[PDB]
Structure formats: C-alpha cells, structure tokens
From a paper:
Polymorphism within these allotypes is focussed on regions of the antigen-binding cleft (cleft polymorphisms in comparison to [name]*57:01: Asp114Asn and Ser116Tyr in [name]*57:03, and Met45Thr, Ala46Glu, Val97Arg and Val103Leu in [name]*58:01). Notably, residues 97, 114 and 116 contribute to the E pocket of the antigen-binding cleft, whilst residue 116 also contributes to the F pocket.
To do so we chose two 9mers containing Arg/Lys at P7 (PΩ-2) that formed a natural part of the [name]*57:01 peptide repertoire, LSSPVTKSF and [name], and designed P7/9 variants, to utilise in thermal stability experiments. [name] was not detected in the repertoire of [name]*57:03 or [name]*58:01. Consistent with the enrichment of P7Arg by [name]*57:01 alone, the P7Gln mutation (chosen due to similar enrichment of this residue at P7 by all allotypes) reduced this difference to ~4 °C by increasing the stability of [name]*57:03 complexes and reducing the stability of [name]*57:01 complexes. As a consequence of these substitutions the C, D, E and F pockets of [name]*57:01 were the deepest and most negatively charged of the three allomorphs.
Residue numbers in the entry:
A (entry chain B): 1 to 97
B (entry chain C): 1 to 9
C (entry chain A): 1 to 276
The structure:
C-alpha cells in the first residue's frame, strides 16, 4: 500500500568551487504523495527552496525535484533531508559530487 | 488540451 | 520522431483537513507545459513552458473551468471509491489518472491512453482498442459497467483521435525549437579505486533530452546487466536529464570494460572507456 522514496542529491552542472550552480534533491518512487523535503547547508535548513509540480511515473509512484541556487566550496557541506510516512525518522543524504 | 468527458466512477 | 501528450491528475483526500486536493499537470514528451493546483491561492490552469503562453484568454479560461470541474468530479469519485471498497471516512486516499495520445512522425495517432489507479494500484484502463475496458477488481468492474452503459469509451476515443492529436500537433509546431530538438548526452567515464584490487568505473550521461536513454556496461563485449548499478534518470532542472551506470571491476582489468550509450540525439550508439 505504501512505497518509500528514492533520494538523489546532485548538482545541475558539474561542481566547481566558487562558481554558482543549482543544488538538486530528486525524490521518486514513493507513495502516498505527502512528503517533507529540506535542503541543508552545514546541517541548517536552506530557506525558500523551490520544487516541481507533483507528478508520477507509469507505475503510479510520485516524483518531485527540490532545488536551490548555491555556490559550492571546499568546506561547506550540503545534504537533503526527507521524511515520509514509510520512514520512522528523517533520512539524510549527503551531497557527493 | 484536456479532455471533457463525463466519467463518474 | 514520435511524440506524446499526457495529462496526470492526482486527487488526494485528507479528512479533517478540507476537501481533497486536486493537482493536474500536462506534458508533451518530457516537457511540462501546464499545471493546476486546487490548493493554490487562486487556482487556474497556468503555463509552465514558453510556447504555451501564446494561447489566448479563451484557452486559459476554458482549461481553468475544466480543471475545476474535474476537481469536483474526482472528489466525488473519491467518495464513490470509498463506498466501493467498504472503507471508512477517516483515512486519506488517492485517485491518479493518466491519459493522452501518442503520434508518429507524420502526426498520425499511434495510440491512445486513459488509465487510473486508486491508492497506487491499477483501477481501470481504456484498452488499446479505445472501445473496451480493463478493470483491475470488482469495484472497478462496477465503474466499468457504468461506463459501458454510458458509452464513455466512444467519447474518449473521439477525444484521443481528434482534439488530443490536433492540439498535440499544434503544440509541437509552436514549440518546435525545443520539443522537436534532441540534445545528445555529454558522456564520460570516471574511475575510483575502492580497494587495492577493485575499482568503480562510472559511466556518466549529462544534459540530454528527452529522458529516454540506454547506458550499459560490457565486459569483454558481454553485457553486465546483473552486475551494473543503474541510477534512476533524474532531471537537471534545465529541461535536460542525467544518468549514470556503475560497475565494480578488478584492478588492472579496466580496459576490458566498455560503456555503451544509446540516445535519440546520437546518430550512432557511443562506445567509451576509462581514459587514465
């Protein structure tokens, strides 16, 4: 009756420190549709993150893209935090270039 | 353009 | 090439939190061009692609009225479905609908679709003949008997053969700079040792459109399907998509592996390797 989200965290363009980019968290394959997604910069929630309009794949599972403008550096850590009814606790996926 | 056909379940 | 138009409706009940949410999105191929959300401050069919914006007030007003009506219809269908499955009014449920048409290079109807799910499971589907139905269970059989009585399939067929294809053609012409452009993948292979005698080879495809792509690893010319890690194709946010395929290989045998890339934007399939 329920399906846990697949989570990918990645950038729109190949990461280059000091160059502006987009941080993406793509959540997919989940059901039902209610889901909570935060983008984290060094553990802290990034404000005003946008997301795509709810849609679904041919197997009826939902997908959403959350995204925000960011400028990657050497020290700064980025992550995606996802909560869903199938998850007992928020799942955090660290961004890996 | 969306469909306009009566489909009550 | 070939093209498709698809609408996706999601209707979600939420007892105690108002009437069911209704969201509709429209796509040509992998390009979203309209949206409707009943939870928006002022719900209306709204543009999501540049080439749809030229449509006049009558288009947006008509589509808005229709999406409001469809929202009402699927709220009612949520209540009905509650009755069909002997379920209580305490729980939240979802009806999903996907419908639309596929046309070939000459714009002729290749095939039509109208299918729905309840709580993520198949409910009812218009068969390829666009004249009969496949119901997934006895509830959906009730709906099927209703739709056979009212000859709904005939009306859907009329839509899918007529307006659906005509308007898809119109959209394809208006957005031909993008909808009729394939962007080939930018490809490369990365190499990361995991140990002294194993290394990951990762074959990357970036910036391609449409989303349909095939990435495969071969070892000595033999497909490594069972041993290949394949991530879901993912949107970059600039209309294009990304994907990779990874294989764990014995150190010193990297050159025995080849990555094969198939995409509409490529004249011929690509073969690439790790280049140290």
């Amino acid at each position: 009756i329920q399906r846990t989200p697949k989570i990918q965290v990645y950038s729109r363009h190949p990461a280059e420190n000091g160059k502006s980019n987009f941080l993406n968290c793509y959540v997919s394959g989940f059901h039902p549709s209610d889901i909570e997604v935060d983008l984290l910069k060094n553990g802290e929630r990034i404000e005003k993150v946008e997301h795509s309009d709810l849609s679904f794949s041919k197997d009826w599972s939902f997908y959403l893209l959350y995204y925000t403008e960011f400028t990657p550096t050497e020290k700064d850590e980025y992550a995606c935090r996802v909560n869903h009814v199938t998850l007992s606790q928020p799942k955090i996926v660290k961004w890996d270039r | 353009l969306t469909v306009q056909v009566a489909r009550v379940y | 090439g070939s093209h498709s138009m698809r609408y996706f409706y999601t209707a979600m009940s939420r007892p105690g939190r108002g009437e069911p949410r209704f969201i509709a999105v429209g796509y040509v191929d992998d390009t979203q061009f309209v949206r409707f959300d009943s939870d928006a401050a002022s719900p209306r069919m709204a543009p999501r692609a540049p080439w749809i914006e030229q449509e006049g007030p009558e288009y947006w007003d008509g589509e808005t009225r229709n999406m409001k009506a469809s929202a009402q219809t699927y709220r009612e269908n949520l209540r009905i479905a509650l009755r069909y499955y002997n379920q209580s009014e305490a729980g939240s449920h979802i009806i999903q609908v996907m419908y639309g048409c596929d046309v070939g290079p000459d714009g002729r109807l290749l095939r039509g679709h109208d299918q729905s799910a309840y709580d993520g499971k198949d409910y009812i589907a218009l068969n390829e003949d666009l004249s009969s139905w496949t119901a997934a269970d006895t509830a959906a059989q009730i709906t099927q008997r209703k739709w056979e009585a009212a000859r709904v399939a005939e009306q859907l067929r009329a839509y899918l053969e007529g307006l659906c294809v005509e308007w898809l053609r119109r959209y394809l012409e208006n957005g031909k700079e993008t909808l009729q452009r394939a962007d080939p993948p930018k490809t490369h292979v990365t190499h990361h040792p995991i140990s002294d005698h194993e290394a990951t080879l990762r074959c990357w495809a970036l910036g391609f459109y449409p989303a349909e792509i095939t990435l495969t690893w071969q070892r000595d010319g033999e497909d490594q399907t069972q041993d290949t890690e394949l991530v879901e194709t993912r949107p970059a946010g600039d209309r294009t998509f990304q994907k990779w395929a990874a294989v764990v290989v014995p150190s010193g045998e990297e050159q025995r592996y080849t990555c094969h890339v198939q995409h509409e934007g490529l004249p011929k399939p690509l073969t690439l390797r790790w280049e140290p």
